[PDB]
Amino acid sequence: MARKKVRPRLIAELARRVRALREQRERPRDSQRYALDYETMMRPHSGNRLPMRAW
Amino acid sequence: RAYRGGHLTIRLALGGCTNRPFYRIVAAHSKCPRDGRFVEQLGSYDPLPNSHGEKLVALNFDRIRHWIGCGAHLSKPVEKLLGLSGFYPLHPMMITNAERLRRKRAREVLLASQKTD
Amino acid sequence: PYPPLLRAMILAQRQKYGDTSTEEPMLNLERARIDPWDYPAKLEAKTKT
Amino acid sequence: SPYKDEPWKYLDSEEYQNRYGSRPVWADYRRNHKGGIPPQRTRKMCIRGNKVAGNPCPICRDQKLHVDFRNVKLLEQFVCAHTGIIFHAPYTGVCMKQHKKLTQAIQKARDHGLLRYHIPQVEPRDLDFSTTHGAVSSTPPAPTLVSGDPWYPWYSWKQPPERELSRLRRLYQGRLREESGPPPELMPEV
Amino acid sequence: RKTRHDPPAKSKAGRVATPPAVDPTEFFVLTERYRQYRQTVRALRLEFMSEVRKKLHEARAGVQAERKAQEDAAEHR
Amino acid sequence: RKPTFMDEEVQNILIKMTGLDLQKIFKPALQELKPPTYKLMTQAQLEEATKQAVEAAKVRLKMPPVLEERAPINDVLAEDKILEGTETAKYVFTDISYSIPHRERFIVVREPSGTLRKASWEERDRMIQVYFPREGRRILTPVIFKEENLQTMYSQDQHVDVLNLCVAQFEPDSAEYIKIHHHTYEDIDKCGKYDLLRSTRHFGGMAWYFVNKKKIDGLLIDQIQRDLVSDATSLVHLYHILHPDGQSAQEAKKQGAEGLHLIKVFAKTEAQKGAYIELTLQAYQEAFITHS
Amino acid sequence: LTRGLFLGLSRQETHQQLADKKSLHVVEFREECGPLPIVVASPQGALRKDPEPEDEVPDITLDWEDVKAAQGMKRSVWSGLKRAAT
Amino acid sequence: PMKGRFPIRRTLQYLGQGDVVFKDSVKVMTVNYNTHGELGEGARKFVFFNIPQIQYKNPWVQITMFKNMTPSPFLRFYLDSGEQVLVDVESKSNKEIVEHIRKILGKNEETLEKEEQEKKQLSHPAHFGPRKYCLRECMCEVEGQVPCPGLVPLPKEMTGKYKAALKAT
RNA sequence: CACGGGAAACAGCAGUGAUAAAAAUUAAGCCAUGAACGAAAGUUUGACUAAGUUAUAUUAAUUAGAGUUGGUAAAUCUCG
RNA sequence: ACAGGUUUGGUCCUGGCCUUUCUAUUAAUUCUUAAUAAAAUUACACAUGCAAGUAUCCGCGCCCCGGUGAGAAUGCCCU
Ligand SMILES: [Mg+2]
Ligand SMILES: [Mg+2]
Ligand SMILES: [Mg+2]
Ligand SMILES: [Mg+2]
Ligand SMILES: [Mg+2]
Ligand SMILES: [Mg+2]
Ligand SMILES: [Mg+2]
Ligand SMILES: [Mg+2]
Ligand SMILES: [Mg+2]
Ligand SMILES: [Mg+2]
Ligand SMILES: [Mg+2]
Ligand SMILES: [Mg+2]
Ligand SMILES: [Mg+2]
Ligand SMILES: [Mg+2]
Ligand SMILES: [Mg+2]
Ligand SMILES: [Mg+2]
Ligand SMILES: [Mg+2]
Ligand SMILES: [Zn+2]
Ligand SMILES: [Zn+2]
């Protein structure tokens, strides 16, 4: 809240902007995203493994 | 404290002392600690059977249905309690576990008359 | 049917206000319709009204 | 002590009367301590096994005194006359053990009415007493109950269609378990 | 509990959950039970939401609320 | 139109027979004391304070209700055979809502047998106590009401205190409340101890009991030896109200009986001991007429 | 201390003395006896018909100690202490 | 409290026992009085005795005094609507002023009792918790129930230790 | 503050160095409550439950040792 | 505070210091067994193990619980 001496945090804004930008620019093509390794049953992108029942 | 998300819920807080459990039925935010802050106290449930062989449950029915009416969510054990009371239909899982229990008694009956032989 | 206690509460509640009708209290499931889990959910963001 | 079963006897005896007079049992006893203000709770217990400790209490110095719920003439001394409250242990000077003993005794005694205390006038619990309301009075049994049926159709176990069972069997294949039939009606014991 | 940024264990690494044995009969029965039960309770829940609509509207814009308002205004003048 | 304990007739008769004794009504109580207060009054202000005190003592005198016994509650709300062996104990469900009257709360019980029934009376009261405790009630029924302890308390003549315990502990329409009030009345009758309840709020109780049980002997005799005959005649009057058709009440209509003569009427026709009544009436009449 | 004490106690004004100088009944209200007006002293001689002037707000010297006691601002660890009998 | 002219009016009791409670329409009460004149007397005693009582029970209402502006004593009340109540207090007694104000914008004893009734239904008897908010903490302390093992140690069977040492063997 | 930069993080449970007058298990379970996810049976959870350790505190008994003896302030004799 | 000791050859006054009560940590000396509660030098550095997954793929969860009191006169109560 408001205390009369409160400091102006600048970098708080900078990091928001920059993160949103690097998010939009590096936003993954779903071609590589859902790409799947059929031997290991493992996503390269997320490092996630698929549930046993879906094999 | 400020949270990101999560819903209103009716659950059991666990009060008690080691080996002697006790529960405060409670309407609380979901993301807050079990025994912690709550919105409103609803009832109490004492699991240990007393002098008369009763488990005491207390339900503030008016307030309970006020909150259900605001879309609060129930815990599986609160569901089981209401159902037992008859304020909700039996929870399917109560019924099923009952059946399983019956079949266990059956197979132990047969195993008993098989071992006796 | 209403569940056993709730039915009792409603019965007694209408006896108190002088409504004698013994017509059974009934719970209306028309709006309780829910789609099975297989039914696909819409990915489209909701317009707030 | 010879008295035992009849403790009250010792209070009417001539040696009691001789020893204590009409004063209370504790009137002449003084607790020994380090300064102006005594320690806020008395010595724990003044007899450990065979050893009787120092300058013993009013109650434990005279072994013929018995604390029961029964002798009111003894217990009466440890309650205020006017205020009907029990003296704290320092006031009298009894040891904590006997003070607790006393408290419990005076309790039992009041609970058998052998000793007097204040019973307030209280109203009745209810404003208007009417046995009319549904809660207390019999309800018109639901049409499910009269017949002998389960309150809902689905409390009862109903055998599934074979097409559906086979369908499941296809879905969960190899992860399957032994199919189970109807549940036994009533549950037997050991 | 762990955090978004706390790397998973090395043992848990090559492991994914193993689902339980399915008893087809009991399981079907159960699914029906749940569908019904949830229907009933959805009904009940709607019943109660309505009750709250009523009570709120009644203790806001209802009869005696207006009586209070008018009477107090008049007393005041 | 069978006369009831709350009928203005019977209320006025009993209020009258009770009597206001301001020294017994307001009696030093064993509670924690605080130093007294002093004010300076006229004769006027003193009379006013006394009259206020009297009105207060009226409220202190308000009779605890008398009710006939309540009917046992047996109602099954449901039977679920499926739950049968699932629990060893019973669940007891108490609606607790701050608005609801305690005679209207729902108290439900799931048994091990699976049936969901309404709670019995005693269970119900015990339960209400648990969740809405009010001082003077123990949940477990106190030892003092066993016959032994009760007899002990009658021998120290605490009868007032017993009645008060009882009013706090049990419920006026209960089985125990009625059992204990009647057993107590019975004991003040066996011993002739009636004056113990005199300026008590409990007087009309044994009045209404003795009228309906048709023992007025002891209470008439007592009332006359205390040199209160206005009360003895109010009492026979009451007896007549609650037994409109009976030989005494009818003969009092025939002979057109004045109060003292009314007591004579009753002495002749109905009362079990006419010897003591006539003798005491004799002694009172003669001795009083010669003294004043 | 003992001079002061005896002086003080000597100068007590009895209820009868008070009754007589004001010429009224002095009436004692116990708390345990309720509203019942115990009459302690009566003015031998002729009682007034005149009520005492009612002072809405009295002017009395107050001791800050008693006021502090009444309002629960005395927190001293030495005051509540359990002591032996008189 | 010793210092002061009428020390009893600095006591919590005296402040409590004054009864006026404004309606919620009242925001500002302004007193205007004089330091002299016989007529003004009552108003002065009002400022001396009751203003403290009043304020204490209406802590959110700005009260403001002005001395020797007008030839005559008065109160003015400023309400939320913009309405302005003007009360001429002239030869009126201290008491009469308090009563007349209580009459105009007070709260009926009915109102006050309803309010305090809504505040006393706030702490429910059947709940459990910290001594501050509740009558009981555990249910360990209700008569028929199972007692806090910190008092009466449990039968060995109900102990989890015993159950575990049983299942092990 | 965290784009960047020092640099490579237990102020999660246990542990350990250092440091301080200051010293709990590198333990067992998800059986109960809670939480996450699942349509669901259910799975996971060092939250927690039940245990381990410790005179820190209460209580209960199986347990006797400490301090003090000029006055305040209960209690002393003979030697050095 | 129900107070007590101590200024002086002595008395009174004024005025400090201390005693008597209650709790917690640590230490010394002593220590039999249970139960319950509580567990605390360190915002210094950390070996090893574990603390977040579920789920027919998407998704949804992942300092929420738990930890700590470093910082800030922060802030309490209330719009
Ligand atoms: Mg995933
Ligand atoms: Mg605990
Ligand atoms: Mg940072
Ligand atoms: Mg650690
Ligand atoms: Mg971390
Ligand atoms: Mg170390
Ligand atoms: Mg430590
Ligand atoms: Mg060590
Ligand atoms: Mg779990
Ligand atoms: Mg689980
Ligand atoms: Mg584990
Ligand atoms: Mg000097
Ligand atoms: Mg000297
Ligand atoms: Mg000094
Ligand atoms: Mg240590
Ligand atoms: Mg925290
Ligand atoms: Mg700073
Ligand atoms: Zn002793
Ligand atoms: Zn407990």
From Swiss-Prot, chain D:
Keywords: Mitochondrion, Phosphoprotein, Ribonucleoprotein, Ribosomal protein, Transit peptide. The modification Phosphoserine is found at S1. GO terms for cellular component: cell junction; mitochondrial small ribosomal subunit; mitochondrion; nucleoplasm. The keyword Aminoacyl-tRNA synthetase does not apply. One of its GO terms (biological process) is mitochondrial translation. The keyword Ribonucleoprotein applies. Signal peptide: none annotated. One of its GO terms (molecular function) is structural constituent of ribosome. It is found in: Mitochondrion. Belongs to the bacterial ribosomal protein bS18 family. Mitochondrion-specific ribosomal protein mS40 subfamily. Component of the mitochondrial ribosome small subunit (28S) which comprises a 12S rRNA and about 30 distinct proteins. This is Small ribosomal subunit protein mS40. It comes from Sus scrofa (Pig). The gene is MRPS18B.
